[PDB]
């Protein structure tokens, strides 16, 4: 650990000033008023995960009931209902092309669903096994490549046609709750109950960097739109922004009013607005530069598990344990 | 301004809503149980009439009432994250090692862990002390005294009366952790059972109607 202490001095030597000082002289975000333009119903139990499609017109929502449903946002119409072998789920992912959806649960398997088939049903093309514990996040790099996060302290990349791990990321000392994919897809990050977020190169199979600034477990992680920074969500009731090139925490988002844990995070396309979902049943929008809470979006009676901003940037969809998922614009 | 395609989509969408409603209504008839035992528990042993690495399920029906029991082999010792899913369960059965004494302090700490969790407050606990006949044989031999393991148990006032007093003492030890919260929404029910009991499903069944009875009293403003 002597090199780590030298590393601790090395990071301090690299950074001249904190982000907060530089951020001070910019025009304020101002009061933003976002009212829910839609509410989506038909989920009869707690919703753990949602993912926005690339089109921004489709999303998939996983729930305690054991029915994974795909619905259309604007009309609010419902496109599919997928029966699940396991009732217990924590993850859902939407493929970039949109043909594939993945489901992961306490069964320790990530089930990948091809939406298009003869007979017009959703079928599982592959069930992926090799994780000793639950999968906490899944994300598609590509139509044939998926990276999974799990409570084994391991993250795994699979070839769906081959059906076994082509690479294993096993640098973590704790259960890895969340995983975020970069815009370039060649690097990704993952966060865990060890309270450390690590930068993973997809091709190498190695951890390039490790960043820790969190008191508690990180439940959620999101990459900045540029792809050079990311934000994390923790039970510490704090959201911290780290930068890849600088390798240091730029800023932390915290307030006295909120002691409850973060459960989700996402960025607007600007990156000015880091949307966050809390255990207090309220979702707060923060000026990213100044760490000042612009406004609060409070339409949920129970905790918000998942929050996502569309790829086009129009809307924020919040799914909660209240059992219906509300779009916000 | 709504096309035949949008209306025909609305057809299969509303059928999806109806099918989800029917599936949910089918699910609500079932009552869900989560069985946690640290070790030496007899989790398989509790119900033998009826009997996937991550989660292992045993399901039994009594009086045409269906019970779903979930036990996890895959998960590690620490259970913080996966417990959050099972906050809709009817009850959580904690089976504990009656026989050995050295386990009992850690077992009580585990009881406090399951009881005091923020997400699992509303749920109650149904407690079976397995292998109590094996405990009675050892205590009748009298070589090892559980009163030595705890100074309060060293002086205690309540099958032989002494073995019965020790058995009631450990039972009260498990109840002692549960009473402290005092909210009253959640109450633990101690029960005693040897290794081979013809039906502990009867005890699970009467405890379940008691819990549902109390929740209904709370719902109807009777209490």
């Amino acid at each position, epitope marked *: 650990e002597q090199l780590k202490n030298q590393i601790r001095d090395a990071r301090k030597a690299c950074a001249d000033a904190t982000l907060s000082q530089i951020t001070n002289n910019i025009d304020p975000v101002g009061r933003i008023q976002m009212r829910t333009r839609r509410t989506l119903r038909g989920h009869l139990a707690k919703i753990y995960a949602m993912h926005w499609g690339t089109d921004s017109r489709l999303l998939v929502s996983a729930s305690q009931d054991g029915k994974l449903i795909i619905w*259309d946002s604007y009309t609010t*119409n419902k*496109v599919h209902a997928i029966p699940l072998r396991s009732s217990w789920v924590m993850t859902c992912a939407y493929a970039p092309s949109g043909n594939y959806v993945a489901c992961g649960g306490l069964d320790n398997i990530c089930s990948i669903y091809n939406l298009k088939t003869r*007979e017009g*049903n959703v079928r599982v093309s592959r069930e992926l096994a090799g994780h000793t514990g639950y999968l906490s996040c899944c994300r598609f790099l590509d139509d044939n490549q998926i990276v999974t996060s799990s409570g084994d302290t391991t993250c795994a990349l699979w070839d769906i046609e081959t059906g076994q791990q082509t690479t294993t990321f096993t640098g973590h000392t704790g259960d890895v709750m969340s995983l975020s994919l970069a815009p370039d897809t060649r690097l990704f990050v993952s966060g865990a109950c060890d309270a450390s977020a690590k930068l993973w190169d997809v091709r190498e199979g190695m951890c390039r960097q490790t960043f820790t600034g969190h008191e508690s477990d990180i439940n959620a992680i999101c990459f900045f739109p540029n792809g050079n920074a990311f934000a994390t969500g923790s039970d510490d009731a704090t959201c911290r922004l780290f930068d890849l090139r600088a390798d240091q925490e730029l800023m932390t988002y915290s307030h006295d009013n909120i002691i409850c844990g973060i459960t989700s995070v996402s960025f607007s396309k600007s990156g000015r607005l880091l949307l966050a979902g809390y255990d207090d049943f309220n979702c707060n929008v923060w000026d990213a530069l100044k760490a000042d809470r612009a406004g609060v979006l409070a339409g949920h009676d129970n905790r918000v598990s998942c929050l996502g901003v569309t790829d086009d940037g129009m809307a924020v969809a919040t799914g909660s344990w209240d059992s219906f998922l509300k779009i916000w614009n | 301004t709504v096309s035949a*395609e949008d209306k*025909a*989509a609305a057809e*299969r969408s509303k059928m999806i809503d109806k099918n989800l409603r029917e599936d949910g209504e089918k699910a609500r008839r079932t009552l869900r149980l989560l069985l946690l035992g640290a070790d030496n528990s007899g989790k398989s042993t509790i119900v033998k009439q009826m009997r996937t690495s991550g989660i292992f399920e045993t399901k039994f029906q009594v009086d045409k009432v269906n019970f779903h029991m979930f036990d996890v082999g895959g998960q590690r010792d620490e259970r913080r994250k996966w417990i959050q899913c099972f906050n809709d369960v009817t009850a959580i059965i904690f089976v504990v090692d009656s026989s050995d004494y050295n386990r009992l302090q850690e077992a009580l700490n585990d009881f406090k862990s399951i009881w005091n969790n923020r997400w699992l407050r509303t749920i109650s606990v149904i407690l079976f002390l397995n292998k109590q006949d094996l405990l009675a044989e050892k205590v009748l031999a009298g070589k090892s005294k559980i009163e030595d393991y705890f100074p309060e148990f060293a002086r205690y006032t309540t099958e032989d009366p002494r073995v019965t007093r020790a058995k009631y003492f450990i039972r009260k030890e498990f109840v002692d952790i549960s009473t402290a919260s005092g909210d009253g929404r959640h109450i633990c029910y101690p029960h005693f059972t040897c290794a081979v009991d013809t039906e502990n499903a009867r005890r699970i069944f009467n405890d379940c109607k008691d819990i549902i009875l109390q929740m209904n009293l709370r719902e109807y403003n009777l209490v």
Partner: single-chain antibody
Amino acid sequence: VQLVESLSCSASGFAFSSFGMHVRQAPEKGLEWVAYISSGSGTIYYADTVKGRFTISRDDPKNTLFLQMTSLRSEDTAMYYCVRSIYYYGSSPFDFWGQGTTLTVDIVMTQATSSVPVTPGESVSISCRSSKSLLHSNGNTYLYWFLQRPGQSPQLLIYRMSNLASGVPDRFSGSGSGTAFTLTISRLEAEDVGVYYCMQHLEYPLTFGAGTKLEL
């Protein structure tokens, strides 16, 4: 996924209750509409000509689309094949057709040239205008095309003039302006030959055209 007929139309190779089901080919001319039933008997629609003298029935164990006939007339006689669909965002309607049988006893869509001479390797266009503006308040254009090879029931090729059905060679393509539309074919080959029919699905009846033909 095979549809057999005896009208009775027995379906083997898919989940029967998940699909909608629906066509009459005149011996003299092209396709013209009969009737539509949704999945699990949601709704029924008819054109006035064949209306009131036919019935649709579904039975899940028998897995069959049914036609019971009244008022039999020289219009009734026809060759019909069972047609089906699935509707959601990402719709691929009119995907697969039945084998066919023979029995012996609103918007107008047509394309100008009934017969088109074909030269290999040269791009050509088949245009059929629509009476009612295909473009809809969402922005989804409901213009469709088919190909019936002789002796084989037709298949889907292009829907909406911006989307192309899978299972189709990519050479066929589309371009469109509001309520006036022009199709693009390229690199025509053997098995391209046949009669192409186009359709409009803003509101029933299913206005099917007599179509145009590729002639070698």
